Amino acid sequence: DVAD
Amino acid sequence: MRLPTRSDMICGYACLKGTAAMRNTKRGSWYIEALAQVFSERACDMHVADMLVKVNALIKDREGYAPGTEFHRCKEMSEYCSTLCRHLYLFPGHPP
Amino acid sequence: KMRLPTRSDMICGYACLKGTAAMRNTKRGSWYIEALAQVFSERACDMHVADMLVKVNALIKDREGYAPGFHRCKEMSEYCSTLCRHLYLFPGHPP
Amino acid sequence: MQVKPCTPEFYQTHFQLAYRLQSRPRGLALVLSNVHFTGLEFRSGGDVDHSTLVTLFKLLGYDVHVLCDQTAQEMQEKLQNFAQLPAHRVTDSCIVALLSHGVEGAIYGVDGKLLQLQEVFQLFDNANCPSLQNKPKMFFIQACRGDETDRGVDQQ
Amino acid sequence: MQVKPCTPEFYQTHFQLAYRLQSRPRGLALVLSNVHFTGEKELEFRSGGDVDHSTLVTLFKLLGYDVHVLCDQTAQEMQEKLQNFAQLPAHRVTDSCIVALLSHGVEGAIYGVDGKLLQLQEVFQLFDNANCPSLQNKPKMFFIQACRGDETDRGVDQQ
């Protein structure tokens, strides 16, 4: 999971 | 006959003001994944605002998996804002 | 165990839209409060809160200013939700 | 004003897919009205709005708290006091109505100072208000979000 | 994927209280995805954006929309091409509209591939009752997959  | 400048819109946001929206590098974004899951299953019998509540429920329960990074066990909360003035049903596949 | 986001399970009704003015009758009060009271008192028995705010939106969209010399001006309400279930108020239950 | 009660049948067929909402009182409700300013005009009709909501929330089964003509600092402090009340653990929901002048994302105190709405919501969030975790929290905000009047457009 | 169909009985018991939504197509839909960014402001390649894009294109087609697609657009291109989309005469004979925007963003704005921002208020305005008469009183859906800041939410334990 990573940030937009 | 007169209208306000803006009405009859519903806008779904992946996250809240100030916060990050989360995306899995393999499965795509949490919000779009939830949105497609809910709309595909429930557009037949649920209006759009109510489906976005189901999306919210899925998002609230999700948790980040990214050990060793800033995002491990992180959370997200989606929201929607609405100027709709009645139920929005998509009536998929009707009339046959 | 399941953990929570920092903020969730809220619903917020706004009398007007971003960058706009909300309307108040100098006698009858705000259009938005009048509408909220009318819908919630009539429909809390069988309609959830987000759906009631949709009915409030329909009422507000159709009203116009009466003030010759603001005359015919308009307003639009909106609501934002992080609710994760239907919100029924179940008024007067059990009896 | 009268609130039509729900039927026992409606409850039985809807409670499983809804927030739990059967506590008596249903929740605490706060109605905060600012009507007199200086620093912004007198809010004529604000008295009617206030009484209407106090009546409404009482009929919906809420224990209503009222505040009138508070400064931005007082609003912050008293909202926080309200959010920290012990009654929230044993009630099923919460209502906060804020009625004043405002701008985008903020509401005026009677001193013409602003309280940011983000600060208000934060008081009731899962971190700061654990007693209301997983419980529905309603906010009704009667304030302008800019000065521009909507002229309206012709329907076609 | 599969979109389960509405029953005729369901339509009969709900059409009176809902927006009119029976046109073929149901509406036009626009899916705009930015994944590869090349401005002075470094923005990370959006791995998995490809999956989001194809999921929505499929979803909206299956829901009966005529799906328009845009990929990797600058801020200026996004405003121009959204305005062009809002202005299409085809909206006059449809019942609804869908716009999905997928990109990096900040509170109230989304990035183009050039690292410049388009304000979301300007986007909604293109479809409003003033600027888009063809969609007056018709339901307009927007889905915005973008960050609204860089605060990560560490979450809170259940009390």
Side-chain angles (χ1 to χ4, degrees), chain E residues 109-149 152-153:
Chain E
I110 57 173
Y111 285 107
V113 301
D114 61 337
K116 292 193 178 161
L117 287 173
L118 179 46
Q119 301 293 314
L120 289 169
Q121 286 319 302
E122 293 181 44
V123 173
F124 305 134
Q125 181 178 44
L126 301 169
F127 296 87
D128 77 14
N129 296 323
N131 299 301
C132 188
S134 287
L135 292 175
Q136 282 184 357
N137 297 292
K138 298 173 185 178
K140 293 169 282 282
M141 291 163 269
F142 296 84
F143 299 106
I144 309 298
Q145 175 64 51
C147 289
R148 296 175 72 186
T152 151
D153 182 0

Side-chain angles (χ1 to χ4, degrees), chain E residues 3 5-8 10-19 21-39 41 43 45-79 81-91 93-149 152-153 155-158:
Chain E
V3 170
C6 167
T7 69
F10 187 88
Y11 180 83
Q12 285 304 122
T13 51
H14 293 80
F15 80 98
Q16 293 182 335
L17 67 238
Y19 283 99
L21 194 26
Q22 281 292 275
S23 66
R24 300 295 194 186
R26 288 278 197 269
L28 275 52
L30 175 67
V31 181
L32 182 309
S33 289
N34 296 332
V35 297
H36 178 66
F37 300 76
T38 73
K41 170 93 188 144
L43 294 161
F45 184 84
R46 296 178 65 257
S47 297
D50 61 329
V51 174
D52 289 340
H53 183 95
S54 61
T55 290
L56 287 188
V57 165
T58 299
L59 177 67
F60 298 152
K61 283 176 157 67
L62 293 184
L63 289 166
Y65 290 77
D66 173 31
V67 186
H68 293 236
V69 296
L70 285 174
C71 296
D72 286 334
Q73 301 291 299
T74 63
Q76 178 179 313
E77 284 171 329
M78 290 186 295
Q79 195 276 344
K81 287 172 194 193
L82 282 156
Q83 179 170 60
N84 291 162
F85 175 84
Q87 292 299 310
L88 293 173
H91 296 293
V93 299
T94 60
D95 287 341
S96 69
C97 187
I98 294 176
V99 171
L101 306 177
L102 309 92
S103 193
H104 281 297
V106 296
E107 174 60 17
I110 57 173
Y111 285 107
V113 301
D114 61 337
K116 292 193 178 161
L117 287 173
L118 179 46
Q119 301 293 314
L120 289 169
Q121 286 319 302
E122 293 181 44
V123 173
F124 305 134
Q125 181 178 44
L126 301 169
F127 296 87
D128 77 14
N129 296 323
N131 299 301
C132 188
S134 287
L135 292 175
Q136 282 184 357
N137 297 292
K138 298 173 185 178
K140 293 169 282 282
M141 291 163 269
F142 296 84
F143 299 106
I144 309 298
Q145 175 64 51
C147 289
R148 296 175 72 186
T152 151
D153 182 0
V156 322
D157 294 329
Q158 276 198 61

Side-chain angles (χ1 to χ4, degrees), chain C residues 33 37-38 40-41, chain D residues 1-3 51-57 59:
Chain C
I33 299 309
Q38 157 184 10
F40 278 53
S41 68
Chain D
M1 198 186 298
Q2 199 166 349
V3 175
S51 60
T52 296
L53 288 182
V54 167
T55 297
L56 174 65
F57 299 150
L59 292 171

Side-chain angles (χ1 to χ4, degrees), chain D residues 80-112 114-118 120-146 150-153:
Chain D
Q80 183 177 55
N81 290 165
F82 178 85
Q84 292 305 311
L85 286 168
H88 304 295
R89 257 197 80 76
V90 296
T91 62
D92 287 341
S93 68
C94 181
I95 292 175
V96 169
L98 301 182
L99 304 80
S100 185
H101 293 300
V103 294
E104 169 64 20
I107 181 166
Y108 283 112
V110 294
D111 60 341
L114 284 171
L115 172 61
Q116 299 297 313
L117 289 174
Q118 281 311 306
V120 174
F121 304 135
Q122 193 172 48
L123 293 176
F124 296 88
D125 81 17
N126 296 320
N128 294 308
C129 191
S131 296
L132 289 176
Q133 288 179 356
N134 291 313
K135 297 180 187 174
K137 294 167 273 286
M138 291 164 270
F139 294 86
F140 303 96
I141 309 296
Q142 171 69 70
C144 291
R145 303 167 75 180
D150 183 354
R151 300 167 198 168
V153 296

